[PDB]
Amino acid sequence: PQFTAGNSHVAQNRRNYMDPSYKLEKLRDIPEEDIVRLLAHRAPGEEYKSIHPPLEEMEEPDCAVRQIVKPTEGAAAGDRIRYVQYTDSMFFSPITPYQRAWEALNRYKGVDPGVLSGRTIIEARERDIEKIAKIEVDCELYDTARTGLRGRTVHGHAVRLDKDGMMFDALRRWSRGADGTVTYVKDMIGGAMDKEVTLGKPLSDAELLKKTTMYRNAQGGVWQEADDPESMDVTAQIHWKRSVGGFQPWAKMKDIKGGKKDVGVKNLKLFTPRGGVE
Amino acid sequence: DEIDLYDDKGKKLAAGVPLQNISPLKNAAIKKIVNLTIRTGAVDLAGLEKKFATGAIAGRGMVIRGVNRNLPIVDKAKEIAKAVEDMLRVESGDDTNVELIAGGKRMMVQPPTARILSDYSVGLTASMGALTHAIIDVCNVSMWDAPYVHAGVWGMYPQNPDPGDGAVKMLVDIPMKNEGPGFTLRNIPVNHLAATVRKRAMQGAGLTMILEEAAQFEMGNCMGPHERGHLLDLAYEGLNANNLLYSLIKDNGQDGSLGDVIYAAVEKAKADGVIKSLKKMPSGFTVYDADDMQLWNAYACTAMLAGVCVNCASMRAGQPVPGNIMQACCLIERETGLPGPDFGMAQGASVSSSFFSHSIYGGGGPGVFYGNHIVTRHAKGQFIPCFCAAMCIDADTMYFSPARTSALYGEVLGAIPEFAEPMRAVAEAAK
Amino acid sequence: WDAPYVHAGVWGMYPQNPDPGDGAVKMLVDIPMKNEGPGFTLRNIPVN
Amino acid sequence: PYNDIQHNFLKAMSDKFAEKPESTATEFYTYGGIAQKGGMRKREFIAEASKIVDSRVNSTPAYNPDAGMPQGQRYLMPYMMNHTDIMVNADDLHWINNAAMQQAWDDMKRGIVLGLDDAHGLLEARLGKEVTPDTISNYMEVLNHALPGGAVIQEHMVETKPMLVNDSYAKIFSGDDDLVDSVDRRFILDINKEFAAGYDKPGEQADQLKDAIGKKIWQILWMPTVVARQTDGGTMFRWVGMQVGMTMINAYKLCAGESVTGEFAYYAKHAAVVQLSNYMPVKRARSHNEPGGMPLGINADSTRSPALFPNDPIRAELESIAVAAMVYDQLWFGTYMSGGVGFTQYASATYTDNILEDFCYKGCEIGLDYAGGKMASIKGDKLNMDILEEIIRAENDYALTQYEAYPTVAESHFGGSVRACCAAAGCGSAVACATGLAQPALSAWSLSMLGHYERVGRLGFFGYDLQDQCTACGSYSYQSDEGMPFEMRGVNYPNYAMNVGHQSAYAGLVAGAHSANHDAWVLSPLWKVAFSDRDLPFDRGYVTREYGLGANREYTKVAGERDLIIAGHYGREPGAKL
Amino acid sequence: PYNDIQHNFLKAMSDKFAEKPESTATEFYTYGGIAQKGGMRKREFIAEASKIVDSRVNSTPAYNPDAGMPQGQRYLMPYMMNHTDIMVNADDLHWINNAAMQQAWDDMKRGIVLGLDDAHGLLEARLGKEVTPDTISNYMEVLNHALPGGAVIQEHMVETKPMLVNDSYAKIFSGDDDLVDSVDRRFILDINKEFAAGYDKPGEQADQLKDAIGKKIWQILWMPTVVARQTDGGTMFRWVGMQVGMTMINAYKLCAGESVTGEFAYYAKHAAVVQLSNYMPVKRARSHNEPGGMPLGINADSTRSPALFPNDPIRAELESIAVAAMVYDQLWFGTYMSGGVGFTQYASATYTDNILEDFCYKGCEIGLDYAGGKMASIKGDKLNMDILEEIIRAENDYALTQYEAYPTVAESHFGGSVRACCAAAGCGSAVACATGLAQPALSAWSLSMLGHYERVGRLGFFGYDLQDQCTACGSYSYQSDEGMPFEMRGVNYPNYAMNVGHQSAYAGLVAGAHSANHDAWVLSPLWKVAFSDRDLPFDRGYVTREYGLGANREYTKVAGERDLIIAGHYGREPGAKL
């Protein structure tokens, strides 16, 4: 597939994170039981609750779709539906909220992702969501400074960073060691855990610039319009085709008075410097 | 324009069907489905009997002491049912129908089409008027007691404009609760529809899209060339035209993701010549255009529904549908540089329904939405059928499920052949 | 660019206003929301 | 008059007029207009108006009797609050001039009842989460911080100044005594304690209530007065949904915004909610929780008389009447549906001078006489048209005779509208006490009105007898919009939808029948319990007393004022007083 | 940022944060929670809660951060009112804590416009009665006694206390200069005086208005604030009906209640009335004159900025925005349609810190740049998608860069929803200034939001972009409920009906196009004139300044308080202070 448009490394990051054929780099290896601790829907070693009998010991509606779509393992077992939630700093988080949903719904079977500015939640059957949490906490989409596991009190994505480059957390779920190592000392909703969970050191600024999916005209990020005109070129095109269609769905752009001459524009001028500070 | 119609198992039902043949304005099956939808009431006589005996004859949390009467309506169920039928009849052999169900605990009422002169809400009123006189006459209720019967049957009406606390239950609502002229057939909860097709997803989507598109006509949205786009959406998304819908689900149902369906749909659109290169961007990315935008929209809407079915059926749960529709639209746009289903309106409704199914502010799970709902009304017919599909697929993971909210409809409306097999009904009539 | 003006002229303040009465098409009867109950359709017709 | 002065009009008439209550003549044109004692407020108003004109940029004029109708060519009479010894100025009964009246209706408007059991069932069904009396206690504590406008989850939230919203809080009640014992008592509205009233033994009322409610838990939530005042009644169920929503997230450690949150919204806003009233047909477009959609029975259940005076069905009528006169006539018909000077005396006639009090106590006496001294004994096989007609004609003659033989009483009730209302209310009362049944009270209403026109040759104002002429027909009708049990009616019941001088009485009759029937409520056991809440500003047990305090400006219970956040008032200049 | 600090965000950022505006780092966890300056109100609120608990019968708890979310792990920041030097506490922007915001909306709600010409026409047709400037002058004098609750016909009427209703009066305006000259000037709202503003010469705005209005006579009547607060907006047209009814009877010597009186009712309540807004579909059931039915253009026309600063289209935008944020977001979405802590900062983001101010002035600059320095020149054959796209992409990059480059700005606008609202408003302003046309502002809105999601990887809250994804489609649609001109939209336009962070900006865009277009109003010449009335309590020409005074409790113009008729307040014990 094409996935998305864009000519810059940020656009390629987007395409990779969306691409199931692309294997995401692993930065850490959090043990499953520590994952369970962090989510705090259950205690490690505790058996999965059921909201209904396993599908196999049940007669389903005579539905063609149920017939041809395999349930996930969590669904087959009748697991509860629980969730994992991340907050992504505007300061070059490796992945951004919208791209999380693109990633999730391309890569995973049977998920319910929701995108907001300061939180992205994914819901799925409990055992399924535990597996997704590990994958997403382990890999390059989670930075221990610019990403946070937060099921409530998410404030901070747009707040300035602290001295060490950590994103603000009002519940203080994390603790930072002298060597930069980040440990979670509370669960993802700020509850007490029986033990601390080490996540690891933050990526460097250069690495963050390299890995991020955001365009950001500050602190050396990619300047969308100056560095990647293709990006808005194609987004604008979508915009105008929706515009024409709402008026008359059958209409072609060429039949419109003052319609676009082409994709893109000839005379876009910018009114900020690179890095924006003046 | 021509399409082939296929059933929920990928088997062809009709070929070379002119697009007009499945129009709500012309298809006898659709017209019948509409007619049944406004005429057919369901009554829980056992519960009504209990209302009278306990004085619980008003609204929620209300009880009137001292007006308890024991009226053997379930006992005399056969007499009541016949009195009603005779009152509803306008002429012998007409389409009047009344049936007792579950040993007379429950009753179906269908006033004849002829009693509806102007106002579709006669389906409710004729039944309510007939039922209360039936009870009074059959159970020999005295003048003094007559008003309690009115309350049992009509609820809080007229003090409350909504007779919802009363005895006769319809799929549709009273005219006042409709959000605009022509919204009549939109005011039908997803859970009621899901119950009605007995939780078979494609029948639910189909039935729901047949009602939505009929409403679209009634709203005035299908005049002139605008019509074609709606008929294409209905045929492809709702009726599995040329097996695109079933095919997308079948091909991805084992280990496919939502994105997989979307991309498979883009590739089919290309193969079928629906979309073609417009311009190649510096990165190599190709923006596509479509000579026939309405047809592309039909293909996109089908992609949308198929993506919803695949993901929700994987989870065997309904809650994913709004976020599914959102990324379906978003991703199909990013893949092609063309506009998503209903030119952005479907994505819009997916945002609001995502919000109002995961927040404190209103809505609920998908089963409490419907085409008339302020949250989900925005798309021009293509959106709500996905919801019904999702709540059919739901394995009772949700609290407000059709089993909880809509059992009565499943039981009473479930055996109506046009409701049970809407696609075959349409395909037959389109021949 | 000009199409919305034509909508205003024909549909009135609708949908912002539930009542399209400012619009261009005049019926004897009214919109369903303004009926005082189910079955009242044919009653919503001014004597004048 | 009634034999006992605590209920007859003889003290009011005596203290209002110089001459005897049965006097037939008086003196006019010699009071000096508003120079007289009853012109005191109007003098006060003239003095104010001058300062108002001074502050206006083009000196637009304001209150000026000379530009209108100057008052007091006759005696400007004071009023006595029913079953009190409190005299008030006529002007001080206008709802605008009376903060107690305003609070009584704001208290009703800002209430919402919400089931809790559905929430517990949802927690269990979807999450398997434990619900205990301790979690419920914690839930209610969080709720009582959140509901008035306190933050429970987010950082950097603004919050409400508590003294601006100090009338907002939440309690729970339940028919399950064992659950009530287990929950922190600070959150309990205790049915056993508010309803220890009985007829044959202590706590019968509680018994009736707990049986009807069963082992269920219900919340009563009161939103801030200032919220009702700034917005409307439609805010209330929504406000509950929001803050119960926030509380649930906190109390049960959920995601702050997951699918379960969404179902909690539907639970709180639709599935388990109990409102004061639904909306209105759009000609009279109104939000939820407004007077237009509030049934008569709910008005009655909002009063505490039946719990405080279990053996006094007529006090229960008159207290319900006083709330209803003010809500339905002064506010709803006199403002919501019209405005201006309004309908103060159309209303106050039913709660002043002990005149309606007199008729209704006599009516009950007559009803009992005809019931062989057995209250509420006329029903079933004993209910017939003959004995009703007999009861009605007897009371109707007693009441209409009072206005004729004691002309001060008619001078007080100077418009035939309130005379009709009151005579009919008395007749309805007689039938109430005789039958313990509301519906037959309508037969008494119809017959009283028709008999009144027939006897006196006049009735009420131009359009007074719309519903009265409809009453016989709608009495026992079961047609679509024409029939309804009395308790369930209101001002959306079609022929009730326009006129003063009726609903006041109706609220009484509905209370009368059920108090005489020894019923602990009229329509809603849930609203009955909620309104017993002793933390409400306005005293729902002593309604006419509260009105009297408000009239004389001695009322200390108004909520929702903004004095704490302003430096002055519009039209009033700041700076120290000499 | 914008070159001129009077409109840029640099003074606000400088005065809010210790670090530089472009700083990327700060310090957390060291403020002592609410011990910090910005915790002052919360400490105040804690001290009050204790008293509230002490007053309750079972000690039901109230405000308690420890039972919710304690505040201030981060800096609790103050805000600067847009285009002022007024700093405020965040807590003081909540509508409940701010009497100026309350008065702003009450003033709008209590207004009704009513033509007089039809009444004269009726007087002539049925009675052959002469109408002269003198009789009109007498009529207005009587009306100004009657409207607030004074009697004009009947004996023994109760009346309202003028200081409780001192904000109620009526004026007339007309395009007929000779009529205006002839009428007693105390009753005139003078168009030539309130609209002396012009562009190429004095009085052009007046000219526009008088041409649109013509030789007609219109009344603006304001009802008492306390009436809005006790009841709802549905009262307003009815109240005008009643008191205009009574005035007609007096000023024209009619029978007090004949057939002509009936036709005067229909004339007043239907035939010639102009309301603020119509009712709502019943899910969100509401009376007339509430925010749900109020079009955006009326919101805009209610501000005075265009008559006070005719060459400053962005000030017009920002003043309309300030009214709209508070009305649509804080009150309507944040209360009428939800409640609780609500939506203070969703709103205040658009009227504080000069952030939206900065974007919109830069926007106008960019749009003018593309319009060759000729404001409003991009119309007709010059109007196309290419130039729009160039304008929108330029300004969108400008505004989104500000949040990224000056992180204090993002920290102030911490929720993506307000960043989106403001970037999009900036784009809309750019198009408004270039085109002088509202509809194309929607094209900028759509592209800005889509460009935002695309650039940043995120947008607003969970359901922020419902209307935004619909925007392109609804742009130029003519389908039933899907299309309509921007000016006429409001929160009953379907996809507009649920969400914060839009209607604020929209009110601005609709004003900007028109001020740039040298139009004296947006939608309604009648409401434009009415709201120019300088006797209104809230200053509709200096909105953000008023909000600032309300915040700091320095506001002196609140109406409708009841301090004059009470001896105390609920929850506050009487007795002298020590």
Ligand code: M43
């Ligand atoms: C200026 S802007 C701002 C405003 C504000 C806010 N809100 Ni919210 N909410 C509310 C509203 C708010 C506002 C305030 C103002 O000021 O305006 C309110 C306030 C409502 C009421 N109830 O009142 C509330 C709160 C309060 C407390 O805390 O309690 C609730 C809760 C909730 N809602 C829902 O539904 C869901 C929820 C829960 C949730 C939670 C969260 C956490 O966890 O933290 C959430 N949400 C999420 C979110 C978000 C979204 C996105 O992201 O975009 C956001 C935030 C972010 C950060 O960073 O901070 C937001 C916001 C914003 O934005 N939100």
Ligand SMILES: C[C@@H](OP(=O)(O)O)[C@H](NC(=O)CCCCCCS)C(=O)O
């Ligand atoms: C959707 C609908 O809720 P229901 O689905 O009917 O519960 C609607 N709420 C409002 O849209 C909430 C708007 C304000 C809160 C959200 C702010 S973004 C209403 O109560 O009428």
Ligand SMILES: O=S(=O)(O)CCS
């Ligand atoms: O119009 S009437 O004269 O009938 C009485 C209104 S108070």
Ligand SMILES: O=S(=O)(O)CCS
């Ligand atoms: O539900 S959301 O978290 O999107 C925001 C509502 S404030």
Ligand SMILES: [Ca+2]
């Ligand atoms: Ca109010």
Ligand SMILES: [Cl-]
């Ligand atoms: Cl005049």
